[PDB]
Design a protein around this ligand. Sequence first.
Ligand SMILES: C[N+](C)(C)CCO
Ligand SMILES: [Ca+2]
Ligand SMILES: [Mg+2]
Length: 343
Amino acid sequence: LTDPLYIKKICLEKVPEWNHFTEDNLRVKQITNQLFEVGLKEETANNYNSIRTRVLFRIYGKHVDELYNTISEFEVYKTMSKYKIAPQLLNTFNGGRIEEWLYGDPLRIDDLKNPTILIGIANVLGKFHTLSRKRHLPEHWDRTPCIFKMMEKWKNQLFKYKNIEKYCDIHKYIKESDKFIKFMKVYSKSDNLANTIVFCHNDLQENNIINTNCLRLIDFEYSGFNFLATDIANFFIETSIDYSVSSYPFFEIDKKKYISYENRKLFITAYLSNYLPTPKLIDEILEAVEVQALGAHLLWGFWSIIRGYQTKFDFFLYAEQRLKMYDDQKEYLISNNIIKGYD
Ligand SMILES: C[N+](C)(C)CCO
Ligand SMILES: [Ca+2]
Ligand SMILES: [Mg+2]
């Protein structure tokens, strides 16, 4: 399946506009899952201007079922595909799918410091979040907030690993997550707009946002119903994490890079213009986002341990950083009297 002759054979069989070509007409380039650009070679492309000349060929990661329900992932994707939110579905094959090729660049860490970019991301997220009240999403879909489901599932998965202390205070964090979850079942019941349940992406970060000749969202693996502030929290956290480091550990974290308050207000203002602003409301949303960040750290800390056991990026050292970020955020929130009856 990493065999380019086979990737070609599948594309010729599954992409109707390409069924007459042979593998001599096709180019394969490799670009947690496996992605290949598949495309018509230059001279072939030049004779076929009326059709797609590229596809994203996607081979499903071998252990993603430990993270999410595979059947649901696809159902959710087809819907985001039909609504033109996600990359268009071209076809499936045994072990993956073929998608529309997006022409554009993922955003980089430094784009998130640009207020104009921040806005367009806010504009896009705001309009995205109205989907559940403006279109009728399948009624059989689970409305339970994904924060709750992802946390329980990922915490429970950690039990499968026995030598887990060797990667240290994991049982403390596990306990800490039970505290977050208990606190959030109370917290989330107040009237705060930041508690509205909407259909969330659940993994916003610059590399899941593509800049085309407009900003598009991608990678809806984790997408599902969640507290709206959850979606904003991940994005805000991600302003301080750079994944482009090209040597061990392949990441950098800089607290000082965390999106300024000035830029956070700007973002929510732009967000609400598309989602729906009282200054009190902006600050109540910003508070909920800071409360949700607490749970984001535990969640992605657990996710990253699970990934480290799957693979063999230093997932374990990244897990360690996110769990440290939980400690810093907890101490920020408690010592500023923002959360109470947590411990
Ligand atoms: C955003 N993380 C890198 C923490 C994992 C999701 O792809
Ligand atoms: Ca980031
Ligand atoms: Mg992605």
